[PDB]
Design a protein around this ligand. Structure first.
Ligand SMILES: CC(C)c1c(C(=O)N[C@H](CO)c2ccccc2)nc(-c2ccc(F)cc2)n1CC[C@@H](O)C[C@@H](O)CC(=O)O
Ligand SMILES: CC(C)c1c(C(=O)N[C@H](CO)c2ccccc2)nc(-c2ccc(F)cc2)n1CC[C@@H](O)C[C@@H](O)CC(=O)O
Ligand SMILES: CC(C)c1c(C(=O)N[C@H](CO)c2ccccc2)nc(-c2ccc(F)cc2)n1CC[C@@H](O)C[C@@H](O)CC(=O)O
Ligand SMILES: CC(C)c1c(C(=O)N[C@H](CO)c2ccccc2)nc(-c2ccc(F)cc2)n1CC[C@@H](O)C[C@@H](O)CC(=O)O
Lengths: 420, 405, 404, 394
């Protein structure tokens, strides 16, 4: 029997009763009367799972089809780590199939690479690329740079004033003061040379710094706030218009990420014997190079691409990112890649391949990497959490694995297009 | 208990044990699909440096029937992505509860705040401006003089009619629009474009493209199909051609937020919002050398909806293309007009990950699951409008947070 | 005098002296050259060094065709050295290409590239498209309204009305399919049309003004914000010109025998291909280039443009070029080269092509003025010559870079 | 020997240095050229007599058959940094000089413009190649150390007095390494000076990495005379900014428009319009018109208008009543000089002398080139003001 709303408020308020005594229908009555907020259903109710169940029932009534959420799962999931960290207004979870592609022979080691995707043939094709690399002695990679960025926009009264601030940041003394404020916000914060650009009285400042094993967006944002506050002391007429003025650039296509790099800049390479190209990849070295020149270079050129000189790097990046608790929206910039191919060896029949990815935004701590299922996929690769002995080594290793797996995916798709 | 290799083969699955099946694989089929995943996980665990790595990677009680031979291979489980709800989104005199699969804290709550501002301001209106998935093969003739001849042939009415007949014959939803061609010496990049009903249409347009190129091969036997995709589509890479010509659904959305609502809900002013939009989304993206990235975080919303609704999440590269504009509005010039224009939303409600039941639950929330029989492509066009509208909600909230500081 | 100078001017200016007219301070003065002299004297007193104008020439130049047409506030002319590179063997013909430049070695290097092409059987070119553009921005009250205008222009009926207004302005005004693009309540409309032998910026601007007035009849709430909303795009870098084309889209090609690559170009075919891939494709890609997949197309375009009375500011878009190179022939030692230039903005009538010195350089190439029997043939031929000469320039410079 | 022989004697012998005199050498080359043209009378109105060919031969042009007169107009005074400039503009486009002159008048009545040079450094961007990507990565890291950069900086700076190497920018593409050398070049544009420093620098780098192959001294990473995002973001040559405030009264009477109309056209044309067109660095009306006209008049490399005209034009409301028009133009890659190339010729030096920037500034190296870059940016702003007013007024 559904009790009145006045009586239900007294039971929940009591210390030795709680929501346990109230029913499903009674809690739904309190939320609709604005006594209890729907987004705090986890804290008020005895368990996290029951809070999600109540929000699903509230949502179902609003929908045109009441049984819409029937096959959206929610039970037996660890909501404790998601609440107040990863998601709000939670109505369940979305299971994404995870396949394995390996072994990927990279830097004299072997990796079993997890790939969360619903695209048919993606895992198996990437697996074929790994097999070709394995029979060809393996791949080698190098991290060329490491530093997450934030690109605020500030505004001085005049262009003459903004020019003065740019010159001030360029002196050794001015940069030293701003570096002191930036680095004071975190243990891993080490500010590199600034990258500034004027647009009239506007000034776009590109802060860059390592962030341990974190992706580092929040850490670099906090350091940027303290740095601009210190700059405000020397220039009180400056106005911080936005902590992100799209000069970072985060989650949008931008030539600045392609040229300067953002996060981890990485390069991989391998040599596939002529026999391996024929038997595994069902093509030739000559055919692979001709498709790479006219698709990945000339084709992308005709399309007006900036940073998209590859076949499907975004497929591999997105799959690994979802599996390993990364920010999947950062696939925009993280998938930037140029794939090159040429002839090699004594008879000029072997296929040299390289992929260069200047802006892989990645981390093994914080965000979705705090969740246990996501940590399982990181644990496969041996990069879960922060490396204490060498800060940033786990995040750098994951970036190398992404670049190497992208190269495996490039080998297989380009071989499929060449053979027809 | 473990039997020899000879005794295990004569019996062979249900009779044998889990330990015996592992011995058969290493020596150099399964009853249920769930059991097949379990055997793959045990073999994988021995190869890893930490054998208990897959402990918290779930796999049991998941419907693998629709995944095997369709969506994923070498399957070792599934990855649960938390789904949240942001709504109601008042769009075209309707109300939508938008599912958002993400692990970024505050994304769903912030998008929900943007929805609240739109709802208190009378709502949003959107229009689909274009619709047509593309494929951009590269072919090659002996000379540039020959590739020019093929370009001119495709430009004639009768030449285009022959290629359109071959293309449209592959599917009942296939309707070939005007071709866009581009020469690079003896190379010729042909951009086929066509509606695909409610499907995203990559497989449908690829099939029509192969038949179209085969027909072109009859008139020009010296032509060589180098690649069915020559990166002129362009699929899953940044490209100005998608920005200018469009790819999939081109969409526009708009709303007017009362000055009262900008102050109380968004904690800012209309003047501050316009100033940040001009200097971040236009001038800022311009200084960064952006093509199509004239927005705050469209990619966050696109990606979250895409994962929840069984889309190709890798297509967020081009689908996130967006320009966000803001100006003063109303009789006192204090209200905030906002528009978002997304020329290349690549989306669908049939095929791929939308065949799975959990993904279909999120599509069913929006009322766009499956193929619309009475009006082909209506559900896919509706989902594209919902994405553009939710992106606009996300733009309002994030831009308000940046302006306020 | 002071008062007497005004009375004589009422009747003429020939009776008054140079110092008298300056005391007071085009149509007032009798001759055109005399008007330039008085303007130079007034300017000299304003300069910190009045002797600056000493070596800027002005006498004995035909100012009749420049006044009220090509330049204002004229104080003389700037002599640009003109050299000749050729013969350029193009489409079974031979061309002597004039090149106005002050860059040392440019003409001689381009001349070497021509020599390589000529010993290898010659080049062949094709015009792929033709149509100058104008890209206005209009504005409707809402995005729902701008979408209504876009759909209306896309129908056969709505396009027919706008095409009729556009085509009524000029003989050569023939409107091709429109290319529109929405940005909220804004609508950017790309009008395109051939323009005979003229570059066609004034002709397409007149057709666009009439087209937007006719569009306002059907949509009275529409506001023409600007006749150019940078969607053309004219004289700025833009991916739309690269993809859709602007003016003449052209391609050239040639096979250079292996012997010619060694003796004339002092390099090999293999060396040339490796530099082309890693400089013009990969190098330009790393630099974030849109349409700049070449060595120095801009050098050749600019030089020919100044010599032949073109708008040299249009080298921004006209120099768009992708240069490709691969192995060729039975032994795979011959060098196949092609250049593709999708947006050569060019003309042989109007503007600086009305001046006699500029017409001399056009007459060398056989493309001066309008082709009567085949309208647009002279402008198309000049675009083919530009693309062919660019290819000559690519061959020589790329060979110099490969050899080190 | 050559002086005694007639014009007709040398021409019939065939069917540079031997002629001795310059003008007669151009005359003989015109006659040989005439017999190859379908219309030999084409050269009639192409002038050549009475021109100083002494500075052109072996410096600026080859196979010379005359000169091309380009009309030069004057737009001014341009009130810039408490000074006044009469800006020469070589063009054949009707109304360009007069429109630019109107923009100068609007700036003059509004108190004048102010400019600042933000950066200075011509670049060359060679491509080198190591055997593997691991090797090219090693060279990148070596150049990034303080000791490695010091050795390369020593070889670069030894080639010239003005050669002072700045921080290198490198980019890997597999086994390729693209290295962007940058340095001031006094008052010269500096393409020749930076190329010589780059050659000696790569030779020193080869001592430490002998398997390195210099594929090309320019690998299109400079980037010279092609559109490139690297020039827009990092700058090339002179990076400059200008600004001015135009009173509401001046916008109405001189420019025939309003401040509100000018800002709306600038937002929707120069920002949103250029954005829709897929532009990188083309956020302006016609900076290229002004850059090209000044460049041809002042002996610059006109082909460098590709990168030099990169410009973003911004406009907003200003003043107490918010009715005045603030304008700014930012041009990050003005490639320019007042010594070398076409600036060696006397007519071109006349136009440089009008602006007071001809030749090399002895007391302050690079001051004349910097001043001319400020004048270009300021004149571009005048051109932006006038054309934008014409479009706004319809
Ligand atoms: C990525 C998967 C794997 C793939 C493959 C592929 O790799 N196939 C090989 C050979 O069958 C393979 C090998 C082992 C196991 C299974 C399959 N072929 C295609 C494909 C389809 C239609 C079409 F018209 C062009 C390519 N795709 C989908 C391509 C898309 O995800 C990005 C693509 O569109 C990006 C681009 O190339 O522009
Ligand atoms: C949208 C999310 C949640 C968000 C918000 C945000 O929406 N905040 C408001 C106010 O707190 C809010 C309102 C209701 C509920 C919860 C939170 N503020 C930031 C943020 C952080 C640091 C920083 F330096 C710049 C912005 N972010 C991260 C956005 C990023 O994913 C793309 C962003 O980096 C793209 C860009 O603007 O460049
Ligand atoms: C075309 C001109 C003449 C040229 C040549 C050239 O053609 N040289 C050959 C040498 O055999 C030649 C042949 C016959 C007659 C005379 C000279 N070599 C260079 C050059 C200089 C320095 C340097 F570091 C990189 C190239 N340049 C300057 C080109 C520039 O205007 C655009 C260039 O910067 C575009 C680019 O490649 O990025
Ligand atoms: C600057 C020149 C002179 C100019 C002017 C101009 O300045 N006009 C004013 C008012 O009449 C004026 C003031 C004083 C003296 C003489 C004339 N109006 C146009 C023009 C023509 C057609 C058309 F459809 C759009 C504008 N143009 C041509 C500009 C072109 O070279 C680049 C332009 O196309 C770049 C662009 O805006 O996209």
């Amino acid at each position: 029997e559904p009790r009145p709303n006045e009586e239900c408020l007294q039971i929940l308020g009591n210390a030795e009763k709680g929501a346990k005594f109230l029913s499903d229908a009674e809690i739904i009555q309190l939320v609709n009367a604005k006594h209890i907020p729907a987004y705090k259903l986890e804290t008020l109710i005895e368990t996290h799972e029951r809070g999600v169940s109540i929000r699903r029932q509230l949502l179902s009534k609003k929908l045109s089809e009441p049984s819409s959420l029937q096959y959206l799962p929610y039970r037996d999931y660890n909501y404790s780590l998601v609440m107040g960290a990863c998601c709000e207004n939670v109505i369940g979870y979305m299971p994404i199939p995870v396949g394995v592609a390996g072994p990927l022979c990279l830097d004299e080691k072997e990796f079993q690479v997890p790939m969360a995707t619903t695209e048919g043939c993606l895992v198996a094709s990437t697996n074929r690329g790994c097999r070709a690399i394995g029979l060809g002695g393996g791949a080698s990679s190098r991290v060329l740079a490491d530093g997450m960025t934030r690109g605020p926009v500030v505004r001085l009264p005049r262009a003459c004033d903004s020019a003065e601030v740019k010159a001030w940041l360029e002196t050794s003394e001015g940069f030293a003061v701003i570096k002191e404020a930036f680095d004071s916000t975190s243990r891993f914060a080490r500010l590199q040379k600034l990258h500034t650009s004027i647009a009239g009285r506007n000034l776009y400042i590109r802060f860059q710094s390592r962030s341990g094993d974190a992706m580092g967006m929040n850490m670099i944002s906090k350091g940027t706030e303290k740095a601009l506050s210190k700059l405000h002391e020397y220039f009180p007429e400056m106005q911080i218009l936005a902590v992100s003025g799209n000069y970072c650039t985060d989650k949008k296509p931008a030539a600045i990420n392609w040229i300067e790099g953002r996060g981890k800049s990485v390069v991989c390479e391998a040599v596939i014997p002529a026999k391996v190209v024929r038997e595994v990849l069902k093509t030739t070295t000559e055919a692979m190079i001709e498709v790479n020149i006219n698709k990945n270079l000339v084709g992308s050129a005709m399309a007006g691409s900036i940073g998209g000189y590859n076949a499907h790097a975004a497929n591999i990046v997105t799959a690994i990112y979802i599996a390993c608790g990364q920010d999947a929206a950062q696939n925009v910039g993280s998938s930037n890649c140029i794939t090159l191919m040429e002839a090699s060896g004594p008879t000029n029949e072997d296929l040299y391949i390289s992929c260069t990815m200047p802006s892989i935004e990645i981390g093994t701590v914080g965000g979705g990497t705090n969740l246990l299922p996501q940590q399982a996929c990181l644990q496969m690769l041996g990069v879960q959490g922060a490396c204490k002995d060498n800060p940033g080594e786990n995040a750098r290793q994951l970036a190398r694995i992404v670049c190497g797996t992208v190269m495996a995916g490039e080998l297989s798709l380009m071989a499929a297009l060449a053979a027809g």
